[PDB]
């Protein structure tokens, strides 16, 4: 969709709701501290609105490089995401256990896997839910090694690449119902 | 690759013989339309959002198109079921509509500057029209006999939301 | 393999418009005034196919309802349960509904086609456009101008 | 048909009479001031004439540019266009409605729309119209976002790109009866 | 529905180069003098087929003539109709014709093969190599040296 | 030629007798009060069938009707056109009309059986019973208590 390009020492780790770009030095893997954010899909904010709750009140890539800047990778291996729960007890008044979200067996992304894409760049190859730990609980009782941020909600298999940016390369790419709105009126059925 | 209704209840005017959902006005009883008469038509619920609401907004969501095609009781009812051009310059006028200048319980089955017709500061006599478009207030819509109580694929834009649910 | 049905008789509401709507919950009706839509204000407490605690009911373990005219000839979403997250100045999920809002926009011959939950907001922060309910625990777990649908080892139903 | 080079910090938006090129800085869109101009045709003043009247009196790209400046993009969507029309309304004396010509539902144009190609540059990939609108009547009496401009007459789907040049990009491609004239004599029939 | 046919009779312009042109107007013929073509100072007023005004017409709602010899034996493109826009000293759209410039430049035996309009220009701004009309309201909407062709629920038409 | 058709609707005049009488013109009914007849302040402008000044109407140049009942079921002479010699204080002789007297003087399952002119009288000395009318030129040439009947050359009918 847009054309981008990518800061040296850094590599990026977007993802296929397909624009989250993790980004960490290069070589390195996320954090706990890696938190990202969203840059939205052609046309989003109208389709679920600008409340909250109003969120369901309707229901490869190419360089943009030149050639003696030889330097580059992309790596993509691949990892199931499941957004699952967990509940934990809280020593509340009384005390309390409370259940919440949580995306597991994760764990794959934060190292090598057998399979992978990975030779030279040049070539080309429900209600309510905001991050991922939300408020006031803690990543560290999730056991998920990173929160990923959506923010400004007035704003607002899975797979994520690995773009290596080395030092001093420039490193650019290509990269990418209820009845009471319209769309019943545009709603063409299962075949 | 294109994109993809009214139940409304309503009772008609006594003593007076009744002709985007529809837009027909009442006569009295007996009697025909003439030069004074227009109707405010009624809307599809919701379009608006779909559609837009301003005195320059017909086209920007959807660029064109082609179309595919008794509340009472038994007691108390009664009754029965282009453009023209002109000296002082054009002005857009149906053509040729003149046309359409047992008893109502058995029923009825059957299948911008663009605000009135005959348009402002123009008159109807130059027009042939028996009839005046008024569209009600182009704030909230706008366009591009009975006798006792009653009852399409489009070319999109791109940029529309509308247009991510559709197919071809 | 229960057969529910129910010979639910009416007198309907002249003048309120009765929106009649819809697993022993027989039918539902919030009864709204004339012309208008559901509000946040408006609320149904539903009817039941008859025949425990709300903590209890997990002991023991399809569609075309038609309406018929009960009166004389003269004076006449696909919805699923969602849940909500939701931030706390004290961080829950609880239930919620969306889909109601494919209700409130879209004779005499009549129609045919076709544990804890007591308080369902558990409105406005919920998402609902308005409010359920089914009452007390034990009862229960179209315009006027002016249900017949379809264990464990220790209890009943294992039987047939 | 002809080679050409683009600036950087812009983006050009040509169409397919197809030659329009219409400008605005690197990420824009356009706005109701973008107001661009025709380059005609091989052979064209001569077909309809140096007279105004006399308009009707006869009835991919690939890159030009090297390699270590690895930057770009294009990017076409689709949307169609219709010339249409439009009244209003003016306190003359008498107060007078003057119908006059519109493009509609190009909107399209001016945000993403779901469908597009877009990665990486260097692969390549009637009588008395003057503008749209024109002389004496607002653009924002139309609605249409903007106007194009056709300028001197006796100079003088819908398909538009959008090549994006960052900046410091070296950006350049390889860019393109009655019977009373002798036509007849030149025309072939209908098979 | 209509079977238009005239059975015209002329005594022809001696001299004069007549020119003869082809939905109730029969034939147009505006009479040139000899050897020459028809210049802006050029019109013709039609001839009709016979059987209101300019703003009523719409109250209501194919080829092959043929000339044959009135006299004795010694004397003797594919047009559209467009229109104009015309920036104004005072913007509008109005009608004008082109395609007649395809007629200017292109015998006893005779020849077979095959609202508001009342003047149209509303010249040369117009981009009409000549000038119309059909005359009043009413009655309307070859060299010499020296017509047969072919509603609404309120008016005439509708019962055939 | 002509097969006149007026699928006609009425709301009927309650109270007041409509007395209905009845070549474009499809039928006349004067309405009347309750029990009377028409006085000579009676007066019936008519209805025609649908589909020129009232010297023009010359350019160009059988019975049974039904009434049927357009509502429920609860709230329920062989006249000739004579002229008139009268004598002035100024000797004319202009149109008038008898047999009118043979109207004034003789449910629900309804009824099926069988230039110049716009105002005749051109009352009382005319030895009309009562006056007509049909109004303007060009739109014209049973009690309650308290149409469908059947040139020149140079007009449109010629070719039918």
């Given at each position: 969709?847009?054309?981008?390009?990518?800061?040296?020492?850094?590599?990026?780790?977007?993802?296929?709701?397909?624009?989250?770009?993790?980004?960490?030095?290069?070589?390195?893997?996320?954090?706990?501290?890696?938190?990202?954010?969203?840059?939205?899909?052609?046309?989003?904010?109208?389709?679920?609105?600008?409340?909250?709750?109003?969120?369901?009140?309707?229901?490869?890539?190419?360089?943009?490089?030149?050639?003696?800047?030889?330097?580059?990778?992309?790596?993509?291996?691949?990892?199931?995401?499941?957004?699952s729960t967990v509940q934990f007890p809280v020593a509340t008044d009384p005390a309390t256990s409370s259940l919440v979200h949580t995306?597991v067996?994760?764990?794959?992304?934060?190292?090598?896997?057998?399979?992978?894409?990975?030779?030279?760049?040049?070539?080309?190859?429900?209600?309510g839910?905001?991050?991922?730990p939300p408020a006031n609980v803690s990543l560290g009782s999730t056991g998920?090694?990173?929160?990923?941020?959506?923010?400004?909600?007035?704003?607002?298999?899975?797979?994520?690449?690995?773009?290596?940016?080395?030092?001093?390369?420039?490193?650019?790419?290509?990269?990418?119902?209820?009845?009471?709105?319209?769309?019943?009126?545009?709603?063409?059925?299962?075949?």
């Amino acid at each position: 969709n847009q054309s981008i390009s990518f800061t040296a020492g850094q590599d990026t780790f977007i993802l296929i709701v397909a624009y989250w770009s993790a980004s960490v030095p290069a070589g390195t893997f996320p954090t706990s501290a890696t938190t990202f954010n969203p840059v939205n899909y052609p046309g989003f904010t109208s389709m679920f609105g600008t409340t909250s709750t109003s969120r369901s009140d309707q229901v490869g890539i190419y360089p943009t490089s030149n050639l003696m800047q030889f330097a580059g990778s992309i790596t993509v291996w691949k990892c199931p995401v499941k957004l699952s729960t967990v509940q934990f007890p809280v020593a509340t008044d009384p005390a309390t256990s409370s259940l919440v979200h949580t995306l597991v067996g994760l764990d794959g992304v934060l190292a090598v896997g057998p399979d992978n894409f990975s030779e030279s760049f040049i070539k080309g190859v429900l209600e309510g839910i905001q991050t991922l730990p939300p408020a006031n609980v803690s990543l560290g009782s999730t056991g998920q090694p990173f929160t990923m941020d959506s923010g400004a909600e007035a704003t607002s298999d899975t797979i994520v690449i690995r773009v290596s940016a080395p030092e001093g390369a420039v490193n650019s790419a290509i990269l990418k119902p209820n009845p009471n709105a319209m769309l019943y009126q545009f709603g063409h059925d299962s075949p």
